[PDB]
Design an enzyme around this catalytic site. Structure first.
Site, PDB file in Angstrom:
ATOM      1  N   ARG B  27       0.833  -1.198   0.000  1.00  0.00           N
ATOM      2  CA  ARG B  27       0.000   0.000   0.000  1.00  0.00           C
ATOM      3  C   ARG B  27       0.869   1.250   0.000  1.00  0.00           C
ATOM      4  O   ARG B  27       1.813   1.365   0.785  1.00  0.00           O
ATOM      5  CB  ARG B  27      -0.924  -0.002   1.223  1.00  0.00           C
ATOM      6  CG  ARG B  27      -1.748   1.258   1.386  1.00  0.00           C
ATOM      7  CD  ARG B  27      -2.916   1.045   2.349  1.00  0.00           C
ATOM      8  NE  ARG B  27      -3.535   2.309   2.727  1.00  0.00           N
ATOM      9  CZ  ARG B  27      -3.230   2.996   3.821  1.00  0.00           C
ATOM     10  NH1 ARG B  27      -2.328   2.553   4.686  1.00  0.00           N
ATOM     11  NH2 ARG B  27      -3.849   4.155   4.058  1.00  0.00           N
ATOM     12  N   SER B  93       3.290  -7.248   1.681  1.00  0.00           N
ATOM     13  CA  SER B  93       2.140  -6.684   2.399  1.00  0.00           C
ATOM     14  C   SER B  93       0.936  -6.717   1.467  1.00  0.00           C
ATOM     15  O   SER B  93       0.550  -7.819   1.044  1.00  0.00           O
ATOM     16  CB  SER B  93       2.531  -5.314   2.957  1.00  0.00           C
ATOM     17  OG  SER B  93       1.636  -4.902   3.981  1.00  0.00           O
ATOM     18  N   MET B  94       0.315  -5.583   1.128  1.00  0.00           N
ATOM     19  CA  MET B  94      -0.820  -5.601   0.208  1.00  0.00           C
ATOM     20  C   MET B  94      -0.473  -6.334  -1.085  1.00  0.00           C
ATOM     21  O   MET B  94      -1.302  -7.062  -1.630  1.00  0.00           O
ATOM     22  CB  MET B  94      -1.275  -4.179  -0.116  1.00  0.00           C
ATOM     23  CG  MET B  94      -2.499  -4.119  -1.029  1.00  0.00           C
ATOM     24  SD  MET B  94      -2.786  -2.453  -1.649  1.00  0.00           S
ATOM     25  CE  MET B  94      -1.421  -2.304  -2.808  1.00  0.00           C
ATOM     26  N   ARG B 126      -4.804  -5.673  14.310  1.00  0.00           N
ATOM     27  CA  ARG B 126      -4.636  -5.196  12.947  1.00  0.00           C
ATOM     28  C   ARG B 126      -5.958  -4.728  12.345  1.00  0.00           C
ATOM     29  O   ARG B 126      -5.966  -3.787  11.544  1.00  0.00           O
ATOM     30  CB  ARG B 126      -3.975  -6.286  12.097  1.00  0.00           C
ATOM     31  CG  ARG B 126      -2.441  -6.163  12.001  1.00  0.00           C
ATOM     32  CD  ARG B 126      -1.730  -5.877  13.328  1.00  0.00           C
ATOM     33  NE  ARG B 126      -1.719  -7.035  14.210  1.00  0.00           N
ATOM     34  CZ  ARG B 126      -0.831  -7.246  15.173  1.00  0.00           C
ATOM     35  NH1 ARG B 126       0.217  -6.448  15.340  1.00  0.00           N
ATOM     36  NH2 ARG B 126      -0.987  -8.296  15.982  1.00  0.00           N
ATOM     37  N   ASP B 217       8.040  -6.861  12.944  1.00  0.00           N
ATOM     38  CA  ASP B 217       6.937  -6.277  12.187  1.00  0.00           C
ATOM     39  C   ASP B 217       5.672  -6.199  13.041  1.00  0.00           C
ATOM     40  O   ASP B 217       5.158  -7.220  13.498  1.00  0.00           O
ATOM     41  CB  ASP B 217       6.704  -7.125  10.938  1.00  0.00           C
ATOM     42  CG  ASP B 217       5.802  -6.468   9.911  1.00  0.00           C
ATOM     43  OD1 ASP B 217       5.015  -5.562  10.245  1.00  0.00           O
ATOM     44  OD2 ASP B 217       5.886  -6.886   8.731  1.00  0.00           O
ATOM     45  N   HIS B 245       8.478  -3.850   9.417  1.00  0.00           N
ATOM     46  CA  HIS B 245       7.611  -4.011   8.253  1.00  0.00           C
ATOM     47  C   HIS B 245       8.312  -3.650   6.947  1.00  0.00           C
ATOM     48  O   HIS B 245       7.983  -4.222   5.900  1.00  0.00           O
ATOM     49  CB  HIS B 245       6.352  -3.163   8.435  1.00  0.00           C
ATOM     50  CG  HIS B 245       5.249  -3.494   7.479  1.00  0.00           C
ATOM     51  ND1 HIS B 245       4.752  -4.770   7.334  1.00  0.00           N
ATOM     52  CD2 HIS B 245       4.521  -2.709   6.649  1.00  0.00           C
ATOM     53  CE1 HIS B 245       3.761  -4.758   6.457  1.00  0.00           C
ATOM     54  NE2 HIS B 245       3.610  -3.521   6.013  1.00  0.00           N
TER      55      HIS B 245
END
Ligand code: NA
Ligand code: NA
Lengths: 268, 268
Positions: B27, B93-94, B126, B217, B245
């Protein structure tokens, strides 16, 4: 010793009988923040517990223009007024910094101390964090409530806690019992922090001290607490695993047992 | 397979010759975020590298009303247009969520994959973090720049990095090379995330997969990445110590060597 101080009335509670322990909360914490987890345990161990509202909290939440030395002198005045010198002291974060600086200038007031989540200086990240927090206040921007709670979760709790669905839900709710209003006093407390390298001064403190670091703490990282313990000639370092900056709420049994064992070990 | 998709032009770069690797950013990340640390290493290993601007980035930064399945179909369309099926895929991630969902619906397009900093569901913390981020955007409040950088530091880097004065200074400066503007596309990307329990679906993915978790993370905690690896019948989990992260920026050699060794191990 201070020569430019004016005593003001600070709210306080004085509970129990016996050897006195003065608790000094961190930034944004009222005296009552010691009541859910620490005061009952200390009362059960036979101590008298003094908790109070730092300058900048509650009735003095609009106070500004004060410094660390103001708060040191406030704490000294409370000890002298209650006639509890020498007292045990428990401080966390800003409260541990106050306790450290109190022991430098008036060691006769403190028989022994626990310093939780502390430091004797700011490193690059923590200096930047403080600049960012001051910038947020000084901009007048107000964080929306859920985003404010998110920041509080990330900044104060261990990864183990964040991964625990039930515990996370509980801490989100706890934030309604412990609001931290953005006040002039809270902004001024942000500056009551090591502006300079204070570790050499702490080499003069002869009293026994326990420094407690929280392994997951990102606000006052454990290595900075170990620096304070290393400076203190009679200071020892203890690390609590799986604990963030609010480790004394998160792991209250572990923190309390360490503190009580330490205080018993230095009994007169 | 999609039946309610309209292909749009997405910016992309196609570098090198040889076996193709499609990188899918997380993202707020443009295709160029793979260029400082990943593409040069992959080119040096002899791969052809495809990087691109996800829907919601750059020329489509005002896009909204799209879903994870839109982005899956965008990625599939890019692979088919370049005639690189089957391709290796690297997602973070995304982007790893997109890669996971792409492998569910169109496995023939992906020969093997690396999924960095991923999950197959959101836990309580989250889910709350995402609600808080959406609340911040939807409130119209803009974070002051230094406070925004503070949040980025806390949320993306390991404790080891934060304790490193020189590294911290460098990452604060890096934020000027990688701004993350609050756009409609960034807000919509926030919803391109596991809304449901997707691990059972991933048990169908037969292709070899490496899942990389970053030990520090807090945005996509490593235990959620291990859940994805455990669901994948031919997925393996690897954890990078001292990585937050943004671990693929923070520990680029460690991440790249793990990815390149994996991709070599599944060579046709
Ligand atoms: Na010591
Ligand atoms: Na597996």
């Amino acid at each position: 010793h201070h020569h430019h101080h004016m005593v003001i009335n600070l709210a306080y509670d004085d509970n129990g009988t016996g050897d006195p322990v003065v608790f000094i909360a961190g930034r944004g914490g009222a005296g009552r923040t010691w009541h859910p987890h620490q005061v009952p345990a200390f009362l059960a161990a036979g101590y008298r517990c003094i908790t109070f509202d730092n300058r900048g909290i509650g009735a003095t939440e609009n106070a500004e223009g004060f410094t660390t030395q103001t708060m040191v002198a406030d704490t000294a005045a409370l000890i002298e007024t209650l006639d509890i010198a020498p007292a045990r002291v428990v401080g966390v974060s800003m409260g541990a910094f106050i306790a450290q600086e109190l022991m430098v200038v008036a060691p006769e007031l403190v028989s022994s101390a626990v310093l939780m989540a502390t430091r004797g200086r700011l490193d690059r990240a923590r200096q930047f964090f403080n600049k960012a927090e001051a910038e947020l206040y000084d901009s007048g921007v107000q964080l929306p409530p859920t985003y404010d709670a998110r920041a509080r979760l990330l900044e104060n709790f261990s990864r183990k806690t964040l991964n625990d669905d039930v515990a996370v839900g509980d801490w989100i709710a706890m934030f309604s019992m412990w609001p931290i209003k953005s006040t002039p006093g809270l902004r001024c407390q942000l500056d009551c922090a090591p502006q300079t390298y204070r570790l050499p001064a702490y080499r003069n403190i002869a009293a026994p001290v326990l420094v407690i670091g929280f392994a997951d703490d990102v606000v006052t990282p454990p290595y900075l607490g170990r620096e304070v313990a290393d400076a203190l000639p009679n200071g020892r370092y203890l690390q609590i695993p799986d604990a963030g900056h609010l480790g004394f709420f998160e792991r209250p049994e572990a923190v309390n047992t360490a503190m009580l064992k330490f205080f018993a070990s230095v009994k007169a």
